[PDB]
Symmetry: C2
């Protein structure tokens, strides 16, 4: 029923063709319940020039949505298209491109409408403008498409960093708990709150790189879990350095001990300073 949610956060509709503002989406992925819209504004057909006027100054980097800020053409189809690229690790990236016609955008331009017409059988966008110029112009090959993949992932990731560090460039090790708790959704288990309230010492912080890497690590969650099959069945709880080289070869993204020690310090309720499979992975499969 994602469509019904898409109606909630969206406030721009055209004969039922609800267009999403760039902010609504970013709010649909950051916040969970927001209702202040009270608007059917876009009916005046300013849309056809509204977006194209403002997209001409878009930041191709990690600000492609932090540059427009609630003005842009985002269709419900494209909305879901971001949801699927939300969860793609590096592995699926080439495949997600290869899932499309893979013969260059000459065969992938129509795939956009094909993306649209797919939802129809089931029953001028900002991206298409950035992907195909004005009327199907730009030849957005894989790497160019891949560029748009990672930064937009980083973007939603990055903006999340501020929402917990309250804008400051540093996130208290205690703040980093809620994000994990908001991730694992096992927050009602006070034992972890009991764990963090004493085991964690309110001290230094975590920068964006250490957090953005960790968030990216979870994008590759599965490949890590498989590399932990031999140990999970062995039930031997993992040590820090073991866990580092593990996630190293698992995701390809190194982490900082300043994170995982806390991750250990919060997830090692057994008190052995070693993460068994049911300790970390067990709660991670709550959602």
């Amino acid at each position: 029923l994602r469509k019904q949610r898409f109606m909630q956060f969206s406030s721009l509709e055209h004969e039922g063709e609800y267009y999403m503002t760039p902010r609504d989406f970013l709010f649909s992925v950051m916040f969970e319940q927001m209702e202040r819209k009270t608007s059917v504004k876009k009916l005046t057909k300013k849309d056809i020039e509204d977006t194209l006027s403002g997209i001409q100054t878009a930041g191709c980097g990690s600000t492609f949505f932090r540059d427009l800020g609630d003005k842009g053409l985002i269709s419900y189809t494209e909305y879901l298209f971001l949801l699927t690229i939300l969860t793609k690790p590096h592995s699926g990236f080439h495949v997600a491109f290869k899932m499309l016609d893979t013969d260059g955008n000459e065969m992938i331009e129509k795939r956009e409408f094909f993306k649209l017409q797919k939802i129809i059988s089931k029953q001028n966008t900002t991206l298409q403008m950035r992907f195909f110029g004005k009327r199907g112009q730009r030849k957005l090959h894989y790497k160019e498409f891949r560029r748009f993949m990672e930064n937009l992932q980083t973007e939603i990731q990055e903006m999340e960093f501020l929402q917990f560090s309250k804008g400051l460039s540093f996130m208290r090790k205690e703040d980093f708990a809620e994000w994990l708790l908001f991730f694992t959704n096992t927050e009602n288990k006070d034992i972890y709150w009991k764990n963090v309230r004493e085991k964690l010492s309110a001290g230094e912080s975590i920068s964006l790189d250490e957090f953005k890497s960790f968030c990216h690590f979870t994008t590759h969650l599965e490949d890590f879990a498989i590399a932990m099959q031999m140990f999970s069945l062995a039930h031997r709880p993992v040590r820090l350095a073991e866990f580092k080289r593990a996630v190293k070869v698992a995701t390809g993204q190194e982490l900082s001990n300043n994170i995982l020690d806390t991750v250990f310090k919060i997830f090692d309720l057994d008190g052995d300073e070693c993460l068994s499979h049911e300790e970390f992975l067990g709660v991670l499969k709550n959602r």
Copy 2:
């Protein structure tokens, strides 16, 4: 009882000499109730090198607190010293400097301790380090002191901008309502919410300059009110252009009609499109 609040947000104490982290203060002025500290950390006397190590990379501009991020020596005395410079407009700036010995920091160095000893009769800081080098070295004249005044005002102002625009460089005209409502504290009067819900159209946004100017305009609130005495007793409600030139000569800071029209559109409940004294000023004196 501000001291009792200072205890809440602070988490670093030394024989009762509670030192404030740079973030606690910024959280004490942005948030209102926060309790996650659970720490008496600084007892290990790492403080004497903790701050001085990190302050060496401080951004002298509008990031002097967005540069350290919860590591710094902020005394309860200095805490209040920021509270008083929080509310100073440009007028009091020279005076606030002139309230001190005014004979150059040679007579103003001791004023820092004098600031401290003042609270004692009543019953190595980060700033002093930035104000007097290491042991009473730097001669922070007025303009240099004034530099620290405005940016720190801008800083707390700026960080507030993100907290409502949710990090995005643009603040929805609807977001700008709550800030005013959080300012006027007349939010329980649904008529304004009734006003904004229909009169305001969810559309374009407001940048930082238009907001930071407006926030600065309220720093000079009184001088504006006096320039409105002749009109308030006249009871004639003010027009936009009239209001512009008014706040122009009042604060010295021009605004954008995109703000005040909404301010009009939200505060003109009488429906005459003209702000009477009791309309705007009347609710502004609620706090």
